[PDB]
Design a binder for this molecule. Structure first.
Ligand SMILES: O=C([C@@H]1CCCC[C@H]1c1ccccc1)N1CCC(O)(Cn2cnc3ccccc3c2=O)CC1
Length: 330
């Protein structure tokens, strides 16, 4: 494959999986390399740690470690990974980066890549009164219980909810009305991070293992309030984050097609291997997926830009090799 894996150094669960995904987000990798981090602390800085891991993954011929990372962002209790979830670990990661790339030539790259626009609204039935509001999203959680494929989920996500009596809406000025409450998409970011909800709550959490399908190609113009010609919302599956187990244990993996070309690889901790399209997609409908990444067709070449070794500044490169030199002593 040419690509190197991450070391299994404890119960990082999904962290490794996620990291590989961010690594193969090339415009994110480049931008991360451009962060001003010569003044930062070797073990306490998050942004420096993510540089180290990315550099290491690009150059090392030996599985890469991640202890300085987990130390940087301070998840170190016996279950701080078991009890958090991926959107969380992501946010911790991308907000430290968002904010470091600020008054920099690469400022705004995170929003550029991940931010989308929602409009959420309530609307009174009998009496006339409307409440519309814009929200920014960096990821989307989709339900699965009673859903066969992603299309159903999207149709369910934008579905209107009813606010019938006993649960009517406080129009305040206009009293208690029955109301239709819904959400609509204005825009979808270059990179779609969709999470599946396979962990529920307290009927009596439980990992749902119910069959749930998803395509290599995902068309989303129906869900946009306004399509445009000349940039449709057509999306190319890039990565499939997988887990096999229950609410007590399991094993986490990610299937990736890094160059978006449809040549897939499985990343099992320290063991990358080629694999079929079938093993990455269809074989994880339910050993099932819990998060998917899509990139917009029109954006692929700009998101998966080639990354030379010259793209790392030398001040960085010097620094890291130094840290390797010291940390080579018995
Ligand atoms: O590793 C685990 C847990 C760790 C403890 C044991 C179960 C394990 C798990 C859970 C669901 C699927 C696969 C593995 N993960 C990673 C993936 C996810 O984070 C996906 N997600 C993400 N967001 C949600 C938001 C609302 C409702 C449900 C979910 C949900 O299931 C859940 C937790």
């Amino acid at each position: 494959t040419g690509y190197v894996g991450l070391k299994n150094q404890g119960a990082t669960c999904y962290m490794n999986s996620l990291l590989q995904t961010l690594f193969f987000t090339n415009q994110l990798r480049k931008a991360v390399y451009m962060m001003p981090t010569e003044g930062d602390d070797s073990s306490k800085s998050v942004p420096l740690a993510l540089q180290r891991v990315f550099y290491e993954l690009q150059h090392s011929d030996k599985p890469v470690g991640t202890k300085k990372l987990t130390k940087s962002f301070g998840w170190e209790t016996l279950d701080s990974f078991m009890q958090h979830d991926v959107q969380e670990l992501c946010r911790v990661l991308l907000d430290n980066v968002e904010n470091k790339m600020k008054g920099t030539c690469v400022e705004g790259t995170i929003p550029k890549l991940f931010r989308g626009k929602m409009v959420s609204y309530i609307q009174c039935k009998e009496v006339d009164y409307r409440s519309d509001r814009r929200e920014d999203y960096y990821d989307i959680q989709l339900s699965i219980k009673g859903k066969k494929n992603i299309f159903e989920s999207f149709v369910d996500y934008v579905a209107v909810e009813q606010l019938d009596g006993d649960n009517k809406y406080d129009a305040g000025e206009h009293g208690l009305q029955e109301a239709e409450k819904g959400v609509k998409f204005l825009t979808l970011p270059p990179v779609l991070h969709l999470q599946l909800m396979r962990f529920m709550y307290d009927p009596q959490n439980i990992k749902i293992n119910d069959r749930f399908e998803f395509p290599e190609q995902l068309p989303l113009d129906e869900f946009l309030q306004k399509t445009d010609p000349k940039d449709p919302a057509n999306y190319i599956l890039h990565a499939v984050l997988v887990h096999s187990g229950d609410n007590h244990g399991g094993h986490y993996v990610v299937y990736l097609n890094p160059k978006g070309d449809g040549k897939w690889c499985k990343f099992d901790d320290d063991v990358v291997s080629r694999c079929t399209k079938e093993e990455a997609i269809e074989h994880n409908y339910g050993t099932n997926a819990y998060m998917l990444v899509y990139i917009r067709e029109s954006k692929l070449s700009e998101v998966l830009q080639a990354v030379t070794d010259h793209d790392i500044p030398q001040q960085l490169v010097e620094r890291l090799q130094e840290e390797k030199r010291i940390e080579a002593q018995k």
